Amino acid sequence: LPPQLSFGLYVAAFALGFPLNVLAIRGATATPSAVYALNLGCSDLLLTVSLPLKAVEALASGAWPLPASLCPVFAVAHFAPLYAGGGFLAALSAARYLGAAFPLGYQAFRRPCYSWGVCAAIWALVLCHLGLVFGLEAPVCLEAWDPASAGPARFSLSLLLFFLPLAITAFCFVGCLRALARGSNIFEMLRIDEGLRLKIYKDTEGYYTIGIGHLLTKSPSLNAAKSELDKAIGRNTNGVITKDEAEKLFNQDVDAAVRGILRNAKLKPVYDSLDAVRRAALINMVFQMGETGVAGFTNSLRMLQQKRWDEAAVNLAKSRWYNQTPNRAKRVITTFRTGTWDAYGSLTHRRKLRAAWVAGGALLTLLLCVGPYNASNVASFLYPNLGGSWRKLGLITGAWSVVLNPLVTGY
Ligand SMILES: COc1ccc(C(=O)N(CC(C)(C)C)c2cccc(C)n2)c(N2CCC(c3cc4ccc([C@@H](CC(=O)O)C5CC5)cc4o3)CC2)c1
């Protein structure tokens, strides 16, 4: 409440803000998360540099110690990096959400230049919106109430530059929570193991293959492969397909791998007794080897039916399958043993957990720092009875985003 306490809290924010954000930048410079943390660290620095001036203003109970014409420029130089901070948190939470909810789809669509593009658009939108609004409608500075005529303009700032990022961050945090519960499925697992190629290639066994691990023929003839490919799609392809056609063959093959297990007497008892994750591991095998091949793993299959996970793991490792494709086999074996997705880097529960925490941290620091000011500034044009201490507090909490913001990124 007293101006001396206001002064101190700003100084604390500066004093904590400066090192923490330089440290943040180095941590980011040592993926989309890094880009957003880097731009957040920079906007935090610009905000930090304006704090000494913000602090002396609070100490003088609102008195602006500089020429009145510099007040609009300082308003931009202070609020610009402030609002940008919010948007980066919103962008970062979006990247985390997309990574958590749609790992593979995200990774396919994602390009490094988009992250910068998004960041640029944020800087652009913020400075254009603030520069115009504060430039057209501006000895007291930031502590002063805005005239009721400046309402529509200042409201558009809060609406667009805070409330919208907030709502989006809230969506991303809820989506992240949902992603945790959703875990992962067999389609994602096989997409990682088989990869994606649009040209005809040879697998580790030397057979002609296309798409997401679709076996074309066991024949050594490339022309027989090109013939079987045109059968599978019903169109002359000449050894090249689209992503859409690949995904269609993928669902048919997963279906075929499942139906193969369903009609197998030696595979079906195990399939029936497993959970979905351990089921996914079985399907992966039958996808790679076929039903008869996997049916011959008599020992391992029996141990899996009796929930003897460790024994089964050790057994499966003695196979030709393990020696020919070790990385893939180890993942499928780990899946079998644990019944989790721990073996799959971009599908793991922890990765989804970190996204939830980043988004949650982001949502909270948006609510607590940039939140209170905008909530009270819009509530100043309505309700002419509003107390002055609400906006003054909001400016303090907003300043503290230079402390909170670097913490949520984890660098
Ligand atoms: C700081 O003030 C603001 C104000 C308004 C918004 C704001 O709401 N808008 C306005 C609009 C929706 C009506 C256009 C806004 C503005 C700039 C850029 C964007 C994308 N949106 C805003 N936002 C919120 C959504 C954010 C976002 C969504 C999003 C989705 C994918 C991604 C990428 C993740 C990555 O980098 O990998 C993925 C690759 C594509 C990055 C992404 O970043 C960007 C910042 C920030």
Numbering used by the authors: 3 to 32, 39 to 146, 168 to 211, 901 to 902, 1002 to 1161, 1903 to 1904, 2214 to 2278
Mind quoting what the paper says about this structure?
In the last decade, free fatty acid receptor 1 (FFAR1 or GPR40) has emerged as an attractive diabetes therapeutic target with both glucose-lowering and weight loss potential. A G-protein coupled receptor that responds to dietary long-chain free fatty acids (FFAs), GPR40 modulates FFA-stimulated insulin secretion in pancreatic β cells and incretin secretion in enteroendocrine cells in a glucose dependent manner. Based upon the disparate pharmacology of these compounds, a widely held hypothesis suggests that aside from the orthosteric site for engaging endogenous FFAs, GPR40 has an additional two distinct allosteric binding sites: A1 engages ligands such as TAK-875 and A2 engages ligands such as AM-163810. Here we report the 2.76-Å crystal structure of human GPR40 complexed with compound 1 bound in a second structurally distinct allosteric site (A2), located at the receptor side facing the membrane lipophilic environment.
The structure shows that compound 1 is highly lipid-exposed and does not participate in any packing interaction in the crystal. This extra-helical allosteric binding site (A2) is a lipid-facing elongated hydrophobic pocket defined by transmembrane helices 3–5 (H3, H4, H5) and ICL2. The A2 site is located in the non-polar region of the receptor, so it was unexpected to find compound 1, a ligand with a carboxylic acid moiety, binding at this location given the penalty of desolvation upon binding. However, the acidic moiety of compound 1 is fully satisfied by four hydrogen bond interactions: three from the side chains of Tyr 442.42, Tyr 114ICL2, Ser 1234.42 and one from water on the cytoplasmic side of the receptor (superscripts indicate Ballesteros–Weinstein numbers). Single-mutant study of Y44F, Y114F, and S123A in GPR40 shows that a simple change of removing the polar hydroxyl group in each of the three residues resulted in significant mitigation of the downstream Gαs stimulation by compound 1 as a result of reduced compound 1 binding at the A2 site. Binding of compound 1 stabilizes the intracellular loop 2 (ICL2) of GPR40 in a helical conformation. The stabilization of ICL2 into a short helix by compound 1 (and presumably other A2 binders) could explain the enhanced G-protein coupling to the Gαs/cAMP pathway by these compounds.
